[PDB]
Amino acid sequence: RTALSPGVLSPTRPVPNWIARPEYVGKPAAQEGSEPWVQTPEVIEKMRVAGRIAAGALAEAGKAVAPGVTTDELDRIAHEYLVDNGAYPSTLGYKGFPKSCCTSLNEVICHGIPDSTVITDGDIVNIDVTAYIGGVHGDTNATFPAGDVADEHRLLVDRTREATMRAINTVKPGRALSVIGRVIESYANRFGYNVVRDFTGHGIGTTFHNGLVVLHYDQPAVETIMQPGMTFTIEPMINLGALDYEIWDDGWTVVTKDRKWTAQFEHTLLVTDTGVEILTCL
Ligand SMILES: [Co+2]
Ligand SMILES: [Co+2]
Ligand SMILES: [K+]
């Protein structure tokens, strides 16, 4: 199977005009980066709805993953699930991004753009979709195997999922945030994988990336302590090869330099009074 190259982007999909757009839609930048890391009880409850809807759109698109299908089609299905449930797709028009989710096949680390690319037997594909509803965001992603995937790649996918869930089960108020990236990296290194460093989880609430940064590698210099009401993502990208990457001219698609495949999972999490709640479940 060759290295991917760009396919052709289908026309911008429309969303019902009654669905409220994030402020950043049709603007070159987003007004985000300085919002409180601990959300209000109101915002938390609204984020459960947004999380649930983003989890539904992810599951629907993942069901369509099969040799034969375009990435564009995965986007059509996610887009249509979000819209039928009253949500705006947060990626759509976010910093000029053209689609309603990110589709990252094989050696694409992240930020892949749904297009005419046809998925083949043995490929892996991450689908990352976010929902904006009631003024808040819910963000989730999963890598899905297509047909008959090599054992090397099923293991990568299974172990990326496992790293993410292990990190999720470390979340508790009063525990250092830096715990997350230590658990992830330590598990990935056990199988000789390398954790992408330059892309991170983020705080999320009324804004998409609110300024809080969640590292997926061991970085004990971070002093941030987890507090009840904090909402953020854990979304580690794990590479079979070297971390070195390139960005396509589209200004978005990140691909590994050696072309070895890479996988990712993502939940939106709430720090509760005693532990964690995953908001992006069905
Ligand atoms: Co995401
Ligand atoms: Co995210
Ligand atoms: K990938």
Side-chain angles (χ1 to χ4, degrees):
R1 215 261 195 226
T2 359
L4 293 146
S5 47
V8 81
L9 315 195
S10 80
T12 322
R13 308 193 145 79
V15 339
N17 271 315
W18 59 276
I19 292 174
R21 265 68 168 163
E23 56 74 32
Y24 52 67
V25 176
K27 294 196 199 142
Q31 293 177 306
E32 58 178 13
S34 311
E35 298 71 51
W37 290 359
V38 169
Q39 310 307 321
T40 65
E42 185 210 347
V43 155
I44 297 167
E45 182 55 42
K46 296 193 299 185
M47 295 179 65
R48 289 190 175 100
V49 172
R52 177 170 63 255
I53 286 160
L58 180 62
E60 281 299 297
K63 292 161 155 189
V65 171
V69 202
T70 51
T71 57
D72 192 73
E73 176 73 353
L74 296 186
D75 181 83
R76 192 200 60 86
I77 295 290
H79 180 104
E80 156 190 308
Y81 189 97
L82 296 165
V83 144
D84 284 0
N85 281 274
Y88 186 89
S90 302
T91 67
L92 188 61
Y94 178 60
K95 305 175 180 196
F97 192 87
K99 289 293 142 199
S100 298
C101 64
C102 318
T103 49
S104 304
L105 280 160
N106 303 352
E107 76 275 15
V108 180
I109 301 197
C110 60
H111 304 164
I113 307 164
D115 69 6
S116 57
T117 309
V118 184
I119 288 188
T120 327
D121 190 73
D123 282 351
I124 69 180
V125 65
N126 180 269
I127 297 170
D128 186 339
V129 211
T130 300
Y132 180 72
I133 188 163
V136 301
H137 293 274
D139 183 6
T140 188
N141 89 40
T143 302
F144 291 94
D148 193 275
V149 170
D151 283 324
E152 194 183 1
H153 299 134
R154 293 177 182 293
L155 287 171
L156 174 57
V157 166
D158 283 345
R159 285 156 175 177
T160 298
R161 190 192 288 108
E162 180 64 19
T164 304
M165 297 315 286
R166 275 182 200 219
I168 294 177
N169 229 207
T170 75
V171 166
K172 88 181 306 239
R175 186 162 283 164
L177 213 223
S178 75
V179 181
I180 291 148
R182 177 160 85 264
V183 156
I184 291 170
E185 183 169 40
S186 156
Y187 190 78
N189 292 170
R190 188 206 288 176
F191 311 101
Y193 301 159
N194 305 115
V195 170
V196 167
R197 299 169 81 79
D198 292 358
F199 307 94
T200 74
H202 42 108
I204 186 171
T206 61
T207 52
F208 191 174
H209 292 69
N210 74 11
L212 170 66
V213 154
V214 182
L215 303 181
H216 300 127
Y217 58 93
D218 188 28
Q219 180 44 290
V222 170
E223 320 198 322
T224 307
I225 304 294
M226 293 185 265
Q227 301 176 62
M230 272 192 162
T231 44
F232 51 78
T233 73
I234 295 167
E235 61 180 284
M237 298 156 187
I238 295 195
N239 280 15
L240 289 168
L243 295 174
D244 317 295
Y245 60 90
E246 284 158 27
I247 294 162
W248 289 356
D249 186 62
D250 62 30
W252 280 103
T253 315
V254 186
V255 208
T256 67
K257 270 210 30 167
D258 56 31
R259 307 310 173 236
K260 281 139 153 300
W261 296 15
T262 169
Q264 191 183 9
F265 288 75
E266 181 175 20
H267 279 299
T268 293
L269 298 319
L270 215 211
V271 188
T272 70
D273 290 328
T274 53
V276 66
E277 182 181 337
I278 313 178
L279 302 192
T280 41
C281 302
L282 287 154

